Every structure is written in structure tokens, then in C-alpha cells.
Design an enzyme around this catalytic site. Structure first.
Site, PDB file in Angstrom:
ATOM      1  N   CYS A  33       4.031   1.555   9.385  1.00 54.87           N
ATOM      2  CA  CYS A  33       3.881   0.514   8.376  1.00 54.87           C
ATOM      3  C   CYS A  33       5.231   0.046   7.848  1.00 54.87           C
ATOM      4  CB  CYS A  33       3.027   1.044   7.229  1.00 54.87           C
ATOM      5  SG  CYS A  33       1.335   1.257   7.774  1.00 54.87           S
ATOM      6  N   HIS A  41       0.812  -1.215   0.000  1.00 56.23           N
ATOM      7  CA  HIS A  41       0.000   0.000   0.000  1.00 56.23           C
ATOM      8  C   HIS A  41       0.849   1.270   0.000  1.00 56.23           C
ATOM      9  CE1 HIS A  41       0.550   0.937   4.296  1.00 56.23           C
ATOM     10  NE2 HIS A  41       0.218  -0.303   4.603  1.00 56.23           N
ATOM     11  N   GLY A  50       2.833   6.006   9.922  1.00 59.13           N
ATOM     12  CA  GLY A  50       4.178   5.849   9.404  1.00 59.13           C
ATOM     13  C   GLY A  50       4.925   4.626   9.893  1.00 59.13           C
TER      14      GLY A  50
HETATM   15  C1  LIG Z   1       0.481   5.135   6.286  1.00 63.83           C
HETATM   16  C2  LIG Z   1       1.074   3.738   6.306  1.00 63.83           C
HETATM   17  O1  LIG Z   1       2.400   3.794   5.826  1.00 63.83           O
HETATM   18  C3  LIG Z   1       1.162   3.257   7.745  1.00 63.83           C
HETATM   19  C4  LIG Z   1       0.085   3.685   8.741  1.00 63.83           C
HETATM   20  O2  LIG Z   1       0.545   4.097   9.739  1.00 63.83           O
HETATM   21  N1  LIG Z   1      -1.364   3.491   8.569  1.00 63.83           N
HETATM   22  C5  LIG Z   1      -2.028   2.984   7.358  1.00 63.83           C
HETATM   23  C6  LIG Z   1      -2.724   3.916   6.583  1.00 63.83           C
HETATM   24  C7  LIG Z   1      -3.405   3.531   5.437  1.00 63.83           C
HETATM   25  C8  LIG Z   1      -3.410   2.200   5.042  1.00 63.83           C
HETATM   26  C9  LIG Z   1      -4.177   1.787   3.769  1.00 63.83           C
HETATM   27  C10 LIG Z   1      -3.913   0.317   3.445  1.00 63.83           C
HETATM   28  C11 LIG Z   1      -5.677   1.995   3.991  1.00 63.83           C
HETATM   29  C12 LIG Z   1      -3.738   2.630   2.570  1.00 63.83           C
HETATM   30  C13 LIG Z   1      -2.736   1.259   5.814  1.00 63.83           C
HETATM   31  C14 LIG Z   1      -2.048   1.643   6.968  1.00 63.83           C
HETATM   32  C15 LIG Z   1      -2.268   3.862   9.644  1.00 63.83           C
HETATM   33  C16 LIG Z   1      -3.586   3.074   9.545  1.00 63.83           C
HETATM   34  O3  LIG Z   1      -3.584   1.877   9.511  1.00 63.83           O
HETATM   35  N2  LIG Z   1      -4.876   3.750   9.507  1.00 63.83           N
HETATM   36  C17 LIG Z   1      -6.078   2.924   9.434  1.00 63.83           C
HETATM   37  C18 LIG Z   1      -7.074   3.480  10.465  1.00 63.83           C
HETATM   38  C19 LIG Z   1      -8.510   2.963  10.362  1.00 63.83           C
HETATM   39  C20 LIG Z   1      -8.818   2.250   9.043  1.00 63.83           C
HETATM   40  C21 LIG Z   1      -8.093   2.899   7.862  1.00 63.83           C
HETATM   41  C22 LIG Z   1      -6.571   2.870   7.983  1.00 63.83           C
HETATM   42  C23 LIG Z   1      -1.732   3.381  10.997  1.00 63.83           C
HETATM   43  C24 LIG Z   1      -1.791   4.193  12.128  1.00 63.83           C
HETATM   44  C25 LIG Z   1      -1.283   3.683  13.313  1.00 63.83           C
HETATM   45  C26 LIG Z   1      -0.741   2.403  13.340  1.00 63.83           C
HETATM   46  N3  LIG Z   1      -0.687   1.644  12.259  1.00 63.83           N
HETATM   47  C27 LIG Z   1      -1.168   2.105  11.122  1.00 63.83           C
END
Ligand SMILES: C[C@@H](O)CC(=O)N(c1ccc(C(C)(C)C)cc1)[C@@H](C(=O)NC1CCCCC1)c1cccnc1
Ligand SMILES: C[C@@H](O)CC(=O)N(c1ccc(C(C)(C)C)cc1)[C@@H](C(=O)NC1CCCCC1)c1cccnc1
Lengths: 305, 305
Positions: A145, A41, A143
Site C-alpha cells: 500500500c 487507511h 505492505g
Molecule cells: C496493509 C496495507 O498497508 C496494504 C495492504 O497490503 N493491504 C490492505 C489491507 C487493508 C486495507 C483496508 C483499507 C481494509 C484497511 C487496505 C489494504 C492488503 C489488502 O488489500 N487486503 C484486502 C484483501 C481482501 C479484502 C480486504 C483487504 C493487500 C494485500 C496484497 C496487495 N495489496 C493489498
């Protein structure tokens, strides 16, 4: 003496963390030999999060669209491919710090260390368990991820987890290093529920043995039980059913302490049925289930790496 | 989201751990530049433990009596000296992996990461607090002596603890890196009592703010209190008195959450007076005091190194 949630030393994994940028999205990648592993992603924008077509989105990306940075040096990306939910970026330089490693898909109830990273830089390390429902209760901010989970055996790093997402419930979901999610989760911003979060019974028993080894034993009772009788209690309290495989895995702790496994099951049964009455076990007021029998033996034997 | 006891990445400290042998005793040393630091009781035998005369025992030791091994390479010891309770072994090679570092003597209530080692090899890493009574509740087995505790600020390792001994009560005692013990403890096998172990009030408040940030807020009450009124409650429950310095240190968390510090004190007061009624806060059934206000901001902001 003493018992702590102990992570593995993280240095061998620190040397593998890089930053991956695609367009405006940056996350963490894992650089082993001449391949950088990261969540697919990374190719998603704000538009793409609700229902991404990763194959279609990938097609719009060439090698030069992936910026990979290790410290302040830029790796040259000479190939890219999608394997399930991870991207594999072939770079022109093998990581000189590549440790001996393996990719492993772990079982629910097993534990690992997480090296939380932001922008390719390590922030901290902590011990996690893969829950029976295939979530982890981590500490992950935006961030994070692409941060990884791992175990270490002497000189070999077994990578078992890559962080992909936070569920709306605030628990965490991710893949093995072949990009297959643990559990039913998908990498899109849609409502996803974890199932029932049950307690890892064999881990609680291991931790009770750790407590006895450490002198904490008020909870040792006068009863014994049977596997089938105990499991009647486990089901009422959302505990995983105990099997003879589990009993066998507890053998070494049983022999060290002289406490038969079924005797410890009866102590746990009384603990579940009566609570802890405001007492603590190893400094905790709850029954802790994120230590495996191996974890206990390691911390109570001093295995180094 | 999520909140975990998070240690610093340990790689910079892994590269400094060596094995020190004197006679039949082996423990861990810390190799920075051309000096290896280790507990002076490495020169003790079975005879010596009850009441060692370290100056007299040292006199019987020459440079060649100290074997220092980094991995499998042997360092040449070209000088030795005693500084308080640590030995400083001058070696003929500067550690090529020496990180930017400082020696710091920390205050009670501050936290640090411990890299537990045996035979010069890292076993695991975990987060600790220096208790108000100057013990730490670690996880240390025989041979862990000379393992170190540290904090990291970007690229600089602040070493603050060297492990020396386990008290008969099973808690742990040790020195700063100038060899001065934290607390009244001495490096001999004699009965030594820790004093009253009080709770680090400012740390509990910080953790309550971490809980609010994470959505755990059933405990926010309808009351406020005063510093003097709260401290009447703190004294009954063996909590450290709260000062205006502590309130000021909590300022950033107060501003982030919109909850005045004295309002959070009143919530903590109700928690102390009524218990938690079988509820949990951030997955704990006890009030956790081993997170500083800085620790909370770091984990809730994503500071990397
Ligand atoms: C940005 C990426 O590099 C890492 C990242 O931090 N996040 C992430 C953002 C978008 C995605 C998509 C696959 C939807 C594009 C996947 C992960 C957020 C996250 O998951 N937000 C959720 C929140 C509720 C549902 C929607 C997405 C996060 C925050 C805190 C801990 N872990 C992860
Ligand atoms: C061997 C040394 O390299 C490191 C080491 O592991 N230990 C140590 C052994 C002797 C000493 C003397 C100063 C007395 C010589 C100092 C430390 C033991 C320990 O403290 N046993 C206590 C036990 C009750 C009182 C007497 C000594 C230990 C075990 C577990 C955790 N931490 C430490």
C-alpha cells in the site's frame, strides 16, 4: 529489434519513497517537496477495516502520531490533512531529491510503471495498464500500500496511481494522487466487484503494429473491414469499441508500416474469430493489450529520459 | 497477489550510465569508481565492421580520442586498455554515485534486469533470462550497445551483462563485465547462428509453483513421475534435463505449497503432451521459463533493497 514490457527507469521515484507508520500500521508514502502522501487507511486498526469512519478516526490522531522515515532519518511531521482517500503529512524538510513532477489522473487503457515498495524500500518495477474497469492486475503483497504508478516525460515524473487495496478477486485498486479512486471502489474491507474486464482494442492494434515492425507478420490477411463492421466483432469478444480518435492515434504506426488501420482491424478480426492456431506473436500466444500506441513508438524509436 | 515480470529498481545503475564517443561512433559506458567500461567496438568505423583487428585499430587511438560524458559534464580520460571485448577508460574522477557492486558471470537460465540506454541516458528497464544458448531476447535498438544487465542484493549491484550486438536473427549477444562473450559469439558483422534454444525446465516449474501460490491450479494432475521418466518428455520438447540440484533448488517452493517436485513434474508432463486447451496460467497461454526459483520467492515474499 525485440519487444518487451518495458518500465520507466525508476530512480527518480526511488528517491521519493518513505515509510509511514501510524500506531501499528506501516505502509509506503511519497515524499515530494515538504509533503508526504499516503493512503488514509494507515490510520486504521483491525477493528476499523470493515466500516471505517475516517473523519472520526483521524480526529484521534495528532501530528506526532505519524512516524515518517526516509531511509533511517526521521522527518518531523508539522501538519496533517485528509484529501479524499489520501493523507497529506506536512514535514519540516523538503525532499532534496524531489524530481520535476505532476499529478495526473489517467484514462482507462493508458499504461504506467509501478514501483512496488515495502516498508518504504523499493522491491521492483513493472509496467501496468489501467483496465477499462479501473482495476490493475499488479503484483502487490501485504505492505505494498502506497506504492505508486507513474510515467516519465524527459525529466518530469507524472504520478498517476497510488496503490490502496487488493480486491477479494486478487486484482488491485487505488487512487490518483489527489486520493480519488479509479473506479467505484472504496477503502474498506467489504465485498467489491469489478465489472466486466474488456480488452483495450487500440492497444492490441498498436501491438500488432509493433509485431509487423519486428518482422512477425503471418497474421496479416487479405481482407479489410469497416469501423462499424469491426465493432460488431469487438462487441462479441468483449473488446472496446474502436473510434476514429483511436484510428487517428494509430496514424504514426500506420504510416511507418504502410498498413492502413482498417486493414489491421481486419487482421485482428480474423485473429479473434479463428484464434492463433498455436502460433505466437512477439513471443505471446494471446493478444496483448497493455501497450499503448505511444508505448510502441517509444520502444521502436528509443526515446530516453 | 498477482505475478508480473518484475525488474529491479534501476536507480543505482542509472547513476553509472555515461556516453562514450570515439570518432563518429557513440555508445553507452558504465562508470564505476574511476573506470568507464564499454564495448571495444566503439573504435570501429563503417570499414571495420566486417573483420576488425581490434589491436591494430586500438593502436591508432590515444586517451584524448575517447570522449566520455556523464550528463553534460566531460570526464578526462587518463588511460585506456582492452580487456577481452571491453574497453576500460581510466578517468580522472571517481563516480560519486558508484554503488556497492560486483562483476559476476551468470549461468544460463539465470535472470537479470536490463537498463536499456541510448546516448548515455536510460530509456527503460525490463527482466531478461540468459537463454541456454547464451542469447538474450531483449529490446535493443541502434545505439543501445553498452547497456547493462544486473541483479541487486540489498545494497549491492551485481553486473552480469553488457550488450554488444544484435544477431541477424534478431536476438541479442553480449559479454560479462570482463568482456568475455556469453556463448560463441564474436564482435564482428559476420553471420552468427545461435544454437537450439531450449526451455529452462527448472524455471517453468518455479513459475508453476508461483501459479499455485496465486490460486491458478486447474493444471495440478493426479499423476506423479520420476526424474528419468520426466526427462524423456523434456528431451522430446527441447526442455533442459532436470537434475537433483534443480529439485533441491525447488525445495522452498515445494515446502510452501505442499506439492512434491516430482508431482509438479507430472503436471508439467501432461501440459507438454496435451497443451493448455485454450486455458491460461498466470495470464499466459504459454509455459513461461524466465522466472527462477529465487525470482518466485522474491516476488511471493516481498524482498526489498
Ligand atoms: C496493509 C496495507 O498497508 C496494504 C495492504 O497490503 N493491504 C490492505 C489491507 C487493508 C486495507 C483496508 C483499507 C481494509 C484497511 C487496505 C489494504 C492488503 C489488502 O488489500 N487486503 C484486502 C484483501 C481482501 C479484502 C480486504 C483487504 C493487500 C494485500 C496484497 C496487495 N495489496 C493489498
Ligand atoms: C552501434 C553500436 O553502438 C550498437 C548497436 O546498436 N549495433 C551494433 C552495430 C555494429 C556492431 C559491430 C560490432 C559490427 C561494429 C555491433 C553492434 C546494432 C547491431 O548489432 N547491428 C548488427 C545487425 C546484424 C549484424 C551486424 C551488426 C544493434 C541494433 C539493435 C540492437 N542491438 C544492436
Amino acid at each position: 529489434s525485440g519487444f518487451r514490457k518495458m518500465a520507466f527507469p525508476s530512480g527518480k521515484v526511488e528517491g521519493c519513497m518513505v515509510q509511514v507508520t501510524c500506531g501499528t500500521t506501516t505502509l509506503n508514502g511519497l515524499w515530494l517537496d515538504d509533503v508526504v502522501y499516503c493512503p488514509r487507511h494507515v490510520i486504521c486498526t483491525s477493528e476499523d477495516m470493515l466500516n471505517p469512519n475516517y473523519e472520526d478516526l483521524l480526529i484521534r490522531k495528532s501530528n506526532h502520531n505519524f512516524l515518517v522515515q526516509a531511509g533511517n532519518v526521521q522527518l518531523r511531521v508539522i501538519g496533517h490533512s485528509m484529501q479524499n482517500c489520501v493523507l497529506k503529512l506536512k514535514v519540516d524538510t523538503a525532499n532534496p531529491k524531489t524530481p520535476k513532477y505532476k499529478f495526473v489522473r489517467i484514462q482507462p487503457g493508458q499504461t504506467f510503471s509501478v514501483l512496488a515498495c515495502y516498508n518504504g524500500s523499493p522491491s521492483g518495477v513493472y509496467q501496468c495498464a489501467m483496465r477499462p474497469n479501473f482495476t490493475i492486475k499488479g503484483s502487490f503483497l501485504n505492505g505494498s500500500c502506497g506504492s505508486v504508478g507513474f510515467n516519465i516525460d524527459y525529466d518530469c515524473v507524472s504520478f498517476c496511481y497510488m496503490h490502496h487495496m487488493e480486491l477479494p478477486t486478487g486484482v488491485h485498486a487505488g487512487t490518483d494522487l489527489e486520493g480519488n479512486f479509479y473506479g467505484p471502489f472504496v477503502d474498506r474491507q467489504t465485498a467489491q466487484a469489478a465489472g466486466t474486464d474488456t480488452t483495450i482494442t487500440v492497444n492490441v492494434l498498436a501491438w500488432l503494429y509493433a509485431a509487423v515492425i519486428n518482422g512477425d507478420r503471418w497474421f496479416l490477411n487479405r481482407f479489410t473491414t469497416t469501423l462499424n463492421d469491426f465493432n460488431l466483432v469487438a462487441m462479441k469478444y468483449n473488446y472496446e469499441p474502436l473510434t476514429q480518435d483511436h484510428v487517428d492515434i494509430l496514424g504514426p504506426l500506420s504510416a511507418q508500416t504502410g498498413i492502413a488501420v482498417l486493414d489491421m482491424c481486419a487482421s485482428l478480426k480474423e485473429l479473434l474469430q479463428n484464434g492463433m492456431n498455436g502460433r505466437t506473436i512477439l513471443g505471446s500466444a494471446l493478444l496483448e493489450d497493455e501497450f499503448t500506441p505511444f508505448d510502441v513508438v517509444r520502444q521502436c524509436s528509443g526515446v530516453t529520459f
